[PDB]
Design a protein around this nucleic acid. Structure first.
Ligand SMILES: [K+]
Ligand SMILES: [K+]
Ligand SMILES: [Mg+2]
Ligand SMILES: [Mg+2]
Ligand SMILES: [Mg+2]
Ligand SMILES: [Mg+2]
Ligand SMILES: [Mg+2]
Ligand SMILES: [Mg+2]
Ligand SMILES: [Mg+2]
Ligand SMILES: [Mg+2]
Ligand SMILES: [Mg+2]
Ligand SMILES: [Mg+2]
Ligand SMILES: [Mg+2]
Ligand SMILES: [Mg+2]
Ligand SMILES: [Mg+2]
Ligand SMILES: [Mg+2]
Ligand SMILES: [Mg+2]
Ligand SMILES: [Mg+2]
Ligand SMILES: [Mg+2]
Ligand SMILES: [Mg+2]
Ligand SMILES: [Mg+2]
Ligand SMILES: [Mg+2]
Ligand SMILES: [Mg+2]
Ligand code: NA
Ligand code: NA
Ligand code: NA
Ligand code: NA
Ligand code: NA
Ligand code: NA
Ligand code: NA
Ligand code: NA
Lengths: 30, 148, 179, 57, 51
RNA sequence: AGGGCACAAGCCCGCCCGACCCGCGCCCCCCGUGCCGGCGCGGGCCGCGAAAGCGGGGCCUACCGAUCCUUCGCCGCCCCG
RNA sequence: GGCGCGUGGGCCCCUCCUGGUAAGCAGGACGGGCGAGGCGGGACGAUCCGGACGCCGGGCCAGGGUGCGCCGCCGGGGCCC
RNA sequence: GAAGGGAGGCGCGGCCCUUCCAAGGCUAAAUACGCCCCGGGACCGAUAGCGGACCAAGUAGCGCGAGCGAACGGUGAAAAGGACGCCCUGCGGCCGCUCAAAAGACCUGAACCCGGCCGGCCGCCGGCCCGCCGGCCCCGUCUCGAAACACGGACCGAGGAGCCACGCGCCGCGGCGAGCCCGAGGGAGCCCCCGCGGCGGAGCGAGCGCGAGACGCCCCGGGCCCGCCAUGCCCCUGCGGGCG
């Protein structure tokens, strides 16, 4: 019997097409 | 690290721990939480009571800093006084130079009554008290006050 | 070959025998107390080595107030704890006592140093009282974890535990006939 | 396409695999369904007994 | 550290508590007593067993 | 359909409405979950009887239904300057 | 006590049953086996008779057999297409 | 279809309070980002990496058209890229030359398949003075059950399939501990210094709200206490307080 708390995370949107909804932080020191 | 994972120890075995009769397929029971009242009714009834339906009244916009209400128990009061002043006040059980504590300055609104107090007079200022908190305070020689 | 060994016999059990921690201090202490027990057979040392092998989830912390309350009829004995000793600000005054622990908080250590008490390490306990003469072995409450209180099946009639997430409905949550 | 309806062929062997578990030793002394007047009297008699009362002082 | 531990363990204060353990069991291979008279004498000193 | 019942559980007569209100537990099916059905109790108010007593329907084993929505009833709480 | 996987098409033997003229047919029951059990025997067989397995040397022998293929036999009593 | 008007996360009517002035207009900074240029990398290394490392790639080629779209890297330090001689009707061959080496259109040069010479006679396991004796159905797969007249598999090489992000549960380990915490960011120091929320610390209740100590090495169980529901008695400031 699995006893877990249910997740409250939304499904991703626009992953292979559309606006770019991913922000990276590789430019933080710069 | 991938060196120490259980999946790397299944190379050479054909089905990777998922069985022969069943196998590893895509979504053999559905996606997400579907089926809660149908084929997953037993699971939902065993572990998640009160999951379906409505209950109580609704507020269209909660005012978050109006409902805020921190509390302090009467047994945590003396820890707000530093140690040197602590021993000084405890030594002289003075009635004319009693310590005065304003819990609102420390971030509390109401005083509750769990625990006990040292036997020594004290003045405590708050916005609200519990019934027992006042009773215990007056039995040790202190008095409660209301502060703006 | 050719023998029956599964008729009145049960499967073997697994128990810890080594500390499992990378900290070298704990390995040294465990080995020393194991040697002492090997050469004397005393029960205090046996329980001490077993305790030193326990995992962190099985070694709850102990407060100074609880220690004071537990030494009411035995103020001259030495309290021995295989865990860390923390402070209790709710207690304005503490008595004088001798305590041997794995670790002390800075505040607990300072409070004990004042009042004339003594904070002892397991190294000094081994040096002075290897067999635990005039010593009391104490532990915290093992069922105090928040994880421990959610074991079981919330939806069954005879359980007394709460569900894990947040639930907003009413079906099965308002008595025996809410279903 | 018909499949089997029922079998109890292997069930007794599975039951005995880890022995037949006995009930807990606290299930024998529960107050689960005892007569309330008896239970109330037992509570008051204990509390008034100086040798077994847990009231402070 | 490690060096400071055997110094403690080799002191007299810790040594006073040591108590010797009894002598261990004696174990030998099984041989036929009737093969030789010495082996038989090990089991029946009187030597009254015909073989 | 199978059990049960004789100064009765059958038939006749007299008075009645326990075919009530509040709150718990157990049995059957069973994962020892739900539903139908039953039983044992603590309080309130009642019926019959001289009284002890019995009575939460038709002697026992069948005769029935979640979430959301609507409608009705007692006592209260909210509409957030 | 905690966490978790696979499984949820089964079949055969012994004894006991139901439907069917019957079936290497269909459906049930206590125990065992194959599945997932090597090895010897039953000429030949997943299940029968013995025996349940690390790699070797020596001894004893279960079940089944002892004209020749092909390891291993004689003696006695009775019958005999 | 108008004169004072708008708003205060439940509608309608009335009375207040708190706040602002629509139906006209302009404005830097802190923010985002391909082509192109510069720098770097625990990245790929010619079936990989971009479709495209090759003096000619969106090329050759295919389709009425919209479109589709490859393959092909490497002599050597230096071209020193093969003297002379002898056979040959010519085609070519031999011998040798350059070079450390032919490395001779080229680094190394495996497997499958094949030609010559030289030795043998049918596969695997075991014993042996070596061809005799004994044993051995074709693997992978679904299946109660496969040597199957169940499916896939001519052969060889190279490639070829549980990784990563976020969320939830539990377990182990480290640091600190009634507390804990490299947030964004700022100091010209990838690793140094400073740095809020948050979570924990008190629960229950639809809600107005009210609000915990009494025992205990640990565990289990009893006993009490808080909130929700219902009741009895007493009383102040009263559908409020206290006690049960
Ligand atoms: K098949
Ligand atoms: K076919
Ligand atoms: Mg394979
Ligand atoms: Mg499956
Ligand atoms: Mg498969
Ligand atoms: Mg089935
Ligand atoms: Mg009668
Ligand atoms: Mg009654
Ligand atoms: Mg299946
Ligand atoms: Mg069949
Ligand atoms: Mg199978
Ligand atoms: Mg088996
Ligand atoms: Mg022979
Ligand atoms: Mg409003
Ligand atoms: Mg701008
Ligand atoms: Mg390429
Ligand atoms: Mg050979
Ligand atoms: Mg052969
Ligand atoms: Mg397959
Ligand atoms: Mg299939
Ligand atoms: Mg088939
Ligand atoms: Mg096969
Ligand atoms: Mg490969
Ligand atoms: Na029923
Ligand atoms: Na066999
Ligand atoms: Na290559
Ligand atoms: Na080279
Ligand atoms: Na076969
Ligand atoms: Na097929
Ligand atoms: Na084929
Ligand atoms: Na307890």
């Amino acid at each position: 019997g699995r006893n877990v708390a249910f997740s409250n995370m939304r499904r991703y949107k626009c992953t292979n097409k559309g606006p770019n909804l991913i922000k990276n932080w590789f430019n933080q020191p710069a | 690290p991938t060196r120490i994972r259980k999946s790397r120890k299944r190379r050479g075995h054909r089905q990777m721990g998922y069985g022969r009769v069943g196998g590893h397929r895509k979504h053999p029971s559905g996606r997400g939480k579907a089926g809660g009242l149908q084929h997953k009714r037993t699971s939902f009834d065993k572990y998640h009571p009160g999951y379906f339906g409505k209950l109580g009244m609704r507020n269209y916009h909660v005012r978050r800093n109006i409902e805020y209400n921190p509390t302090i128990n009467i047994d945590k009061i003396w820890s707000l006084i530093p140690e040197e002043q602590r021993d000084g006040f405890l030594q002289r059980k003075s009635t004319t130079e009693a310590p005065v504590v304003d819990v609102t300055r420390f971030g509390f609104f109401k005083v509750l009554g769990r625990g006990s107090l040292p036997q020594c007079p004290i003045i405590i200022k708050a916005r609200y008290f519990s019934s027992d908190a006042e009773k215990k305070l007056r039995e040790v020689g202190g008095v409660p006050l209301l502060v703006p | 070959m050719g023998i029956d060994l599964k008729t009145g016999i049960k499967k073997r059990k697994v128990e810890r025998k080594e500390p499992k921690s990378p900290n070298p201090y704990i390995r040294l202490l465990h080995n020393a107390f194991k040697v002492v027990y090997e050469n004397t057979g005393e029960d205090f040392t046996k329980v001490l080595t077993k305790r030193l092998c326990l995992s962190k989830t099985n070694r709850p912390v102990l407060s100074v107030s609880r220690l004071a309350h537990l030494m009411h009829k035995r103020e001259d004995k030495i309290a021995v704890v295989a865990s860390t000793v923390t402070n209790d600000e709710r207690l304005v005054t503490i008595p004088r006592m001798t305590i041997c622990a794995l670790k002390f908080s800075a505040t607990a250590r300072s409070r004990i140093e004042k009042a004339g008490g003594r904070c002892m390490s397991f190294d000094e306990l081994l040096a002075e009282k290897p067999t635990g003469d005039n010593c009391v072995l104490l532990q915290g409450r093992r069922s105090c974890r928040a994880v421990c209180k959610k074991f079981g099946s919330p939806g069954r009639p005879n359980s007394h535990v709460k569900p894990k997430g947040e639930h907003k409905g009413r079906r099965g949550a308002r008595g025996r006939h809410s279903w | 396409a018909k499949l089997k309806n029922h079998t109890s062929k292997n069930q007794n062997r599975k039951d005995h695999r880890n022995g037949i578990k006995k009930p807990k030793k606290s299930a024998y002394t529960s107050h689960k369904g005892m007569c309330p007047k008896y239970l109330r009297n037992l509570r008051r008699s204990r509390a008034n007994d100086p040798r077994q009362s847990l009231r402070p002082n | 550290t490690q060096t400071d531990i055997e110094r403690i363990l080799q002191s007299d204060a810790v040594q006073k508590t040591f108590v010797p353990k009894r002598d261990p069991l004696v174990i030998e291979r099984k041989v036929d007593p009737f093969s030789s008279k010495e082996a038989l004498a090990r089991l029946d000193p009187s030597g009254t067993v015909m073989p």
